[PDB]
Design a binder for these strands. Structure first.
Ligand code: MG
Ligand code: MG
Ligand code: MG
Ligand code: MG
Ligand code: MG
Ligand code: MG
Ligand code: MG
Ligand code: MG
Ligand code: MG
Ligand code: MG
Ligand code: MG
Ligand code: MG
Ligand code: MG
Ligand code: MG
Ligand code: MG
Ligand code: MG
Ligand code: MG
Ligand code: MG
Ligand code: MG
Ligand code: MG
Ligand code: ZN
Lengths: 69, 50, 102, 155, 57, 31
RNA sequence: AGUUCUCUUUUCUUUGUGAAGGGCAGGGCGCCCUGGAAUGGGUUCGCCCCGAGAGAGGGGCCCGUGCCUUGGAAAGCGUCGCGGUUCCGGCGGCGUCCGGUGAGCUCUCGCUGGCCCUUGAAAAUCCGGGGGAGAGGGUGUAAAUCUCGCGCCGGGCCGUACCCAUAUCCGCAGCAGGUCUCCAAGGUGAACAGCCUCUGGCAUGUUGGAACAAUGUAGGUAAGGGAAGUCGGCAAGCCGGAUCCGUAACUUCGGGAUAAGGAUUGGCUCUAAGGGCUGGCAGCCGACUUAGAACUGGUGCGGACCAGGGGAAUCCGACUGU
RNA sequence: CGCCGUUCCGAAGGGACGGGCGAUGGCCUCCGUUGCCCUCAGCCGAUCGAAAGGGAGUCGGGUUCAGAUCCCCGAAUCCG
């Protein structure tokens, strides 16, 4: 697993051809955006709820999205 | 043992299949004399030596 | 700070198997603060009852399980432990229930 | 019936010993036809198989006794079986004293209650067993400081 | 308390069978097999007793 | 599952001494 | 969850986070720079260190199995409540919390020492360095080149069940024998001793019932005497722990030695001494010890268990070992 | 029949960066392959020998009547 610090590099990682799906996990303190690439499960930890919704709506089209409960 | 060779595991398997009772129809053959498998083996009473 | 706990005996009292007031009195004369069961530590542990729920508030440390320890003790006194069961209803409440018998 | 299998599987599902598996003696027919862990998991949920609690092994007796020993009880001449050195090795007693007394001198030197010249002299005396404990050492340092101060006045 | 068993068929305490305890997410202690401890290079001078710096052991 | 059920069933089973030879195979008649 | 006649804010159970990556603690350095030290200083349990550079500052590096983080709460577990085909990786609610302490035991990492007329593998395999034969392009759509970050494809063959030992192995057998290992709880206690107990396991060891003669086998106890028994104190018995005191001949000066010989030992209630953290003082934390005193019981108290009889001599062999 | 012997009475290397020659190919541009020649080369002992020595790299959860670090879910890694 790899942890991503900035949104910019998460968006790029979602646009890689080997990114299979994005898992959106909501906790009490943060929203974690996990994308499964060929080698690593990259994660973006978001502490702001508003930024999370903005990101969820701007993922590249065609990437399978799964919300986790 | 668990650590086995292919040759040993194969020799053991042939000993496994020989160790069975005779078919019961063998009794009804015309000149038959056999009453039971007289070459049966038990893992405790008699040992294979290998 | 303020620590508040409650006891829910609604099901038995509605069945007329225990009286809240008698239970209420028992707690007053037993609850130990600093190992004293008379004065509730000097009113520090205030005990307020409702129609079928008893609430206990303490401004000092006061274990919730201690209420369970006394509650079960009081039930044995009244020969109810073979029928009623004390379970936690929330993070601050115990309630009395019936074993699933017939 | 013969519930050897159910006892074995229930133990494996419950992750306890076969000695803690309890089978409802009134329902052995229901239990008898549970030949799989899926069915055992159902009987566990239903309540025909339960895990008995651990047998009580209370430390209250020894906790009460240990409190008594901390006050000196049951520690007299008649309650000792290993030698004094085995009960408390001298090396460990020496080790504690040296660390304590060197720690004091190090701090005293850092706080400039003593100079490096008095520290070195006292360090070698500490190694010589001159001072029994912290207090004795601290009093000696006090006595030394006064006599030195008197000499400074006379100079 | 819980008692451990080897996870491999090597039942002897040899130099290639050393382990360490590890609590898992399932809340049990298991054996993890350590790797051997590496050594930094020794100087080519054959004199200095210490090992070289700036190099992975 | 309540652990007092272990005691309840044990004592109930200990009551079979009086009804030897007609013990009900299943007390949970429903189903 | 257990006990609750009385007492017990009580006793018991349980109260997660992998590999790999990153960050940070912590440990280690025979690593660097300033500088120049005797009124020598630094320092450990011991040591040991210094003008071939100590103290004191400021740095660099190695291991980080420790904590956090991505993993990862989604999982697991505890518990209460509902469902279903009901043999569903069923679904929900809450929780999975905070500190302390140790010559403690087990493993491991490291520093430093001692022993040797003993110096305690090799090879596969992988890596660094020195050298500079060469190669690459002529200002670029730059080239040779790259042990950097991603991406793509694959890893064939053989073993793998179970027993592993008072019943799966060898002793003709389900034979009191033999047979290599790992993990290792609470109490007492010097203790992996013995004794009791939790986790786990077992059903008394190839049968049962009723009696309680002799003779046995294995355990015990005996008045008075005390080796008179016998080839011979064989056997049993005395002693036995720990604290304080005391201790001969002889001696190869190391021993003899626990020589020999005495006293003490319970329970209970106190006293004194022995420390850390923070800001000759004040406050807060503490871990087991030692020593002394009173009181006390039908003088019992190493109350079981564990646990040397001793002395004076002669012969032989120095001893340890076989 | 064989035994001794293991580097000892041996012409014991079948390899290579690179260079020169031809012959063939294909994403025939130029690069490959293949054969010959030049050049360079200690290893110096075939082979066997350890399921406890050396030896890269896998862990968590679930799952069976009986198998799981091997199956499934997930997350990694070494080598080529
Ligand atoms: Mg046999
Ligand atoms: Mg000493
Ligand atoms: Mg090996
Ligand atoms: Mg961890
Ligand atoms: Mg220095
Ligand atoms: Mg959860
Ligand atoms: Mg170079
Ligand atoms: Mg196996
Ligand atoms: Mg017997
Ligand atoms: Mg029997
Ligand atoms: Mg037997
Ligand atoms: Mg017998
Ligand atoms: Mg007599
Ligand atoms: Mg007598
Ligand atoms: Mg005589
Ligand atoms: Mg005679
Ligand atoms: Mg004798
Ligand atoms: Mg003598
Ligand atoms: Mg001799
Ligand atoms: Mg091997
Ligand atoms: Zn050097």
């Amino acid at each position: 697993p790899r942890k991503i610090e900035e949104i910019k590099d998460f968006l790029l990682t979602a646009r890689r051809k080997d990114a299979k799906s994005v898992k959106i996990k909501k906790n009490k303190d943060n929203v974690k955006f996990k994308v499964r690439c060929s080698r690593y499960l990259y994660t973006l930890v978001i502490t702001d709820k508003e930024k999370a919704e903005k990101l969820k709506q701007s993922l590249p089209p065609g990437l399978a999205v799964k919300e986790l409960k | 043992s668990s650590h086995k060779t292919f040759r040993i595991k194969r020799f053991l398997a042939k000993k496994q299949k020989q160790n069975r009772p005779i078919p019961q129809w063998i009794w009804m053959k015309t000149g038959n004399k056999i009453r039971y498998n007289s070459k049966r083996r038990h893992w405790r009473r008699t040992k294979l030596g290998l | 700070q303020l620590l508040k706990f409650t006891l829910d005996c609604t099901h038995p009292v509605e069945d007329g198997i225990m009286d809240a007031a008698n239970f209420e009195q028992f707690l007053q004369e037993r609850i130990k603060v600093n190992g004293k069961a008379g004065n509730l530590g000097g009113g520090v542990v205030s005990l307020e009852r409702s129609k079928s729920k008893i609430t206990v508030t303490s401004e000092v440390p006061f274990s919730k399980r201690y209420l369970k320890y006394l509650t079960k003790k009081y039930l044995k006194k009244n020969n109810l432990r073979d029928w009623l069961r004390v379970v936690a209803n929330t993070k601050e409440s115990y309630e009395l229930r019936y074993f699933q018998i017939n | 019936s013969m519930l050897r299998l159910q006892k074995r599987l229930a133990s494996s599902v419950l992750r306890c010993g076969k000695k803690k598996v309890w089978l409802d003696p009134n329902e052995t027919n229901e239990i008898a036809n549970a030949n799989s862990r899926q069915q055992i998991r159902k009987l566990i949920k239903d309540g025909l198989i339960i895990r008995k609690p651990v047998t009580v092994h209370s430390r209250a007796r020894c906790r009460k006794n240990t409190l008594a020993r901390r006050k000196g009880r049951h520690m007299g001449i008649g309650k000792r079986k290993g030698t004094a050195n085995a009960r408390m090795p001298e090396k460990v007693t020496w080790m504690r004293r040296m660390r304590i007394l060197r720690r004091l001198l190090r701090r005293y030197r850092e706080s400039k209650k003593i100079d490096r010249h008095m520290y070195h002299s006292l360090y070698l005396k500490v190694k010589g067993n001159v001072f029994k404990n912290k207090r004795i050492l601290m009093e000696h340092i006090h006595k030394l400081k006064a006599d030195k101060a008197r000499k400074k006045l006379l100079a | 308390v819980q008692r451990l068993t080897y996870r491999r068929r090597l039942s002897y305490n040899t130099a290639s069978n050393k382990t360490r305890l590890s609590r898992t997410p399932g809340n049990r202690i298991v054996y993890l097999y350590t790797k051997k401890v590496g050594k930094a290079p020794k100087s080519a001078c054959g004199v200095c007793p210490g090992r070289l710096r700036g190099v992975r052991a | 599952v309540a652990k007092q059920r272990i005691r309840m069933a044990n004592e109930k089973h200990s009551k079979n001494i009086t009804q030897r030879g007609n013990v009900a195979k299943t007390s949970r008649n429903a189903p």
